[PDB]
Amino acid sequence: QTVNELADMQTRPLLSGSVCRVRDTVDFLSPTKRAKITFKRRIGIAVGELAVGPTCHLNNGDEANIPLFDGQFHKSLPHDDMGRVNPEAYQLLLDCIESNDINVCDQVPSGVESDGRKLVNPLGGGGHQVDGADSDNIFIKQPDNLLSERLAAQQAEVYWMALLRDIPFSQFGTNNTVQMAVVNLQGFDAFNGLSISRDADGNIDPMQDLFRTDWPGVSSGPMVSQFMLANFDIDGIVVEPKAKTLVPEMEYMTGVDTWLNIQNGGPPEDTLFVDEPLFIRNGRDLAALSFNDVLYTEAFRTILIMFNESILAEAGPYGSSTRQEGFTTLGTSHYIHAMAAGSSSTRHAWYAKWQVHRVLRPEAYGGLLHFVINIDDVPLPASIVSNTELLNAVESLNQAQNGGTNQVFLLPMAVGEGSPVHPAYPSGHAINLGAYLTVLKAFLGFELGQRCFPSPMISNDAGTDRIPFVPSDGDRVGTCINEDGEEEVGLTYEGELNKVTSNVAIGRSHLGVHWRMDGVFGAEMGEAGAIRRLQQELGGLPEARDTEGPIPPASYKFRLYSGTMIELFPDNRYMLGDQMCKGFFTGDDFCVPAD
């Protein structure tokens, strides 16, 4: 560093946009070499994504074949006195969805003269997604047809749920009206599929099956996820999950006048909440949970609990590391950010809702059922039209609730506004939770998924206190593994994770705004969006490299809602069941054989 050399050295502004092809970073990759690999990888993902080919998003035929759009979403639009849509008005809504243009959509007629309720984001599915699977490129199953047998059965489930809102889950085994609901529901031959939970003999046990799914763990122990019942800690604030829930004994839209005013977009009945907050203990509380939440609220609570319990510290490669722990990759930050991103901001649900299916809501179905039994000529199945057991119970509730008008067969709603003003199929809640939780299950892994949820609880009947949960004979509680790998009879994390999506998705059904299918196949769609993200990300992570040493490369091995086992590997290969596959996951019914 000679006298002259020193005297000659110069400097310049070091700026954010300055470029340095040479720098002293402690990194086995050069500056330009790191950028290139990141570049190639991004191209690969875009090509790979395109190679999947367009999804078979096919309308079920109802819109072309049912008279005056009675099978279609048109809430907040102009209707006649029977709630049939002004056809021009619906035509203008189609122009809106078609166009994906915000100014066109603003021309869609409202059903009241002013302050009418807004369409919830009819442009929402049309965006070109930077990463993950594009808005129109995750499959969901076709919804059942308006006139179908299985739709009647689903509407019957929702009426039953409405009738049982206030009955604590604790007393389902011994309650008379829940037994009646069960017998009634088993009488429907078309009520299978849709992750419906039955016992070993094929019946619907009131305590363990009614209103639940058959996803692994959902029908073991209590209806309510341990995660919806535990204390969680946020920023050192210790929070008991007592919520200002919906008030017992109130229903809405129990008369043609209140129902029709809603269908047109007019001001709702005042929704009312309790004064003293309570734990979740009945169908109305699940309805409340799904009404008062906001995207990842429930999933955020659940990951906070999982951290607090220190279970995620044992997951992934660092589960075997004596000297290190992950944070930004295969540690806490990664887990919590990947969880939130996992649902692709609910955009697949929006594409399916508007561009594809445009399905009517259960409160709209109940309108037709009301007017079929009393003005209209829609050939709904005899299984619901002549179901006097259910229909007598339904009209009594409406009478008590509507100020004494008899023979009204509308779906009593748990909130004054009824459903959100967007189509019924699929549920956005179901996409969101389906995804968030898939992500959690993936990072936890199958094995740690079998670990016992420590100190299980259930709410008392008033929801003022929690009681310890202890397995008995009926419960369906299997083996789990404790902090010591020491086997116990108890609830598993995997099982309790499935219940969170199950409680939220089926909560929307208790609320009166969704059929089972919207939540069940909705959760599938979310599970697929999450898996697509996980797959894209995995290969670029440091811990995805195959290296020399005791610690092996990262992979995600876990179990889907359907129960089939999936294992995700870095190089876009995955195991599905006993099958090896390559490329981007589309669903559990599909596999491009690996070779």
Q: What are the residue numbers of the active site?
A: 422, 429
How far apart CA 90 and CA 70 sit, in angstroms, is 11
Smallest distance from the beta carbon of 408 to a copy of itself, in angstroms? 30
| Cross-strand pairs, 232 | 239
Least distance in Å: CB of 175 to ligand VO4?
Answer: 27
> Which entry of ligand VO4, a copy of itself, none binds 532, CB below 5 to 8 A by partner kind?
none
Distance of closest approach, residue 537 Cβ to ligand VO4, in angstroms:
22
Single out the residue of 434, 433, 478 nearest to residue 452, CA to CA: 478
Between residues 295 and 457, which has the closer beta carbon with respect to ligand VO4? 295
Nearer to a copy of itself, 228 or 391 (CB): 228
Measured from the CB atom, the residue of 428 and 495 that comes closer to a copy of itself is 428
Question: From CA 68, how far away is CA 558, in angstroms rounded?
Answer: 46
Which does residue 325 touch among a copy of itself, ligand VO4, none (CB within 5 to 8 A, set by kind)? a copy of itself
Residue 201 has a CB neighbour count (10 Å cut-off) of 6
Dihedral sign (CA 287, 288, 291, 295): negative
Residue closer to ligand VO4, measured from CB, 150 or 508: 508
Inter-CA distances, 131 with 299, 447, 500, 575, Å: 22, 30, 27, 23
What amino acid occupies position 345?
S
State which residue, 252 or 569, has the beta carbon closest to ligand VO4. Answer: 252
**Pick 168 or 342: Cβ nearer ligand VO4:** 342
Complex with ligand VO4: residue 517 or 591, whichever CB lies closer: 517
4 binds, among ligand VO4, a copy of itself, none (CB under 5 to 8 A by kind): a copy of itself
Q: Cα–Cα distance between 122 and 97 in angstroms, integer? A: 6
Say which DSSP state 191 is in: -
**Residue 516 found at the interface with ligand VO4 (CB under 6 A):** no
Q: Rounded to the nearest whole angstrom, what is the least distance from the CB of residue 347 to a copy of itself in the complex?
A: 5
Shortest Cβ 212–ligand VO4 spacing (Å): 18
Distance of CA 391 to the CA centre of its chain: 30
427 binds, among a copy of itself, ligand VO4, none (CB under 5 to 8 A by kind): ligand VO4
Judged by CB under 6 A, the chain residues 429 through 448 that form the site for ligand VO4 are 429
CB 336, min distance to a copy of itself, A: 5
Q: To the nearest whole angstrom, how small is the minimum distance from the Cβ of residue 514 to ligand VO4?
A: 6
Residue bearing tokens 């619906």: 90
Count of alpha carbons within 13 angstroms of residue 276, beta-carbon side: 4
- Residue 234: its H or E element: strand 232-234
Q: In whole angstroms, how close is the CB of 361 to ligand VO4 at the nearest point? A: 8
Residues 6+ apart with CB under 8 A from 163: 177, 181, 393, 394, 397
Reading phi first (left if > 0) and then psi (alpha if -120 to 50, else beta), residue 520 is in alpha
Gaps in the chain after residue (C–N beyond 2.5 Å):
374
Residues 373-432 that bind ligand VO4 (CB under 6 A): 419-420, 427-429
Phi then psi for residue 127, to 5 deg, are -85, 150
- Tell me the angle at which helices 516-538 and 493-511 cross, rounded to the nearest 10 degrees: 140
- 229/525 with CB nearer ligand VO4: 525
Across the chain, which distance is largest between two alpha carbons, in Å? 104
Number of residues in contact with ligand VO4, rule: CB under 6 A? 8
Distance CA 232, CA 518 (A): 30
Q: Residue 153 and residue 145: Cα distance in Å, rounded?
A: 12
> Which H, E and C letters describe 391-418, residue by residue?
HHHHHHHHHHHHCCCCCCCCCCECCCCC
143-182: contacts with ligand VO4 (CB under 6 A): none
Q: Which residue is nearest to ligand VO4 (CB)?
A: 429
Partner whose binding site includes residue 106, from a copy of itself, ligand VO4, none (CB under 5 to 8 Å by kind): a copy of itself
Q: Which residue has the tokens 């209103």?
A: 211
Q: Which residue has the tokens 């009955």?
A: 167
508 binds, among ligand VO4, a copy of itself, none (CB under 5 to 8 A by kind): ligand VO4
- Among residues 321 and 405, whose Cβ is nearest to a copy of itself? 321
Distances (CA, A) of 170 to 21, 455, 467: 67, 18, 11
587 binds, among a copy of itself, ligand VO4, none (CB under 5 to 8 A by kind): a copy of itself
For 229, counting Cβ atoms within 10 Å of its Cβ (0-12 exposed, 13-18 middle, 19+ buried), the class is: buried
Instruction: Tell me which of ligand VO4, a copy of itself, none is bound by residue 148, counting a contact when its beta carbon lies within the kind-specific cut-off of 5 to 8 angstroms.
Output: none
Q: Which does 331 bind (CB under 5 to 8 A by kind): a copy of itself, ligand VO4, none?
A: a copy of itself
CA dist 136 and 220 (Å) reads: 36
Angle 162-165-166 from CA coordinates, rounded to 5°? 145
Complex with a copy of itself: residue 370 or 422, whichever CB lies closer? 422
Q: Return the one option of ligand VO4, a copy of itself, none that residue 419 interacts with (CB less than 5 to 8 A, by type).
A: ligand VO4
CB of 35 to a copy of itself, least distance (A): 6
Least CB distance from residue 397 to ligand VO4, whole Å? 22
Encoding tokens for residue 223? 């209806």
Rounded CA-CA distance 15/74 in Å is 55
Site string for ligand VO4, 474-513 (x = CB under 6 A): ----------------------------------x----x
- Residues at the contact surface with ligand VO4, assessed by CB under 6 A: 419-420, 427-429, 508, 513-514
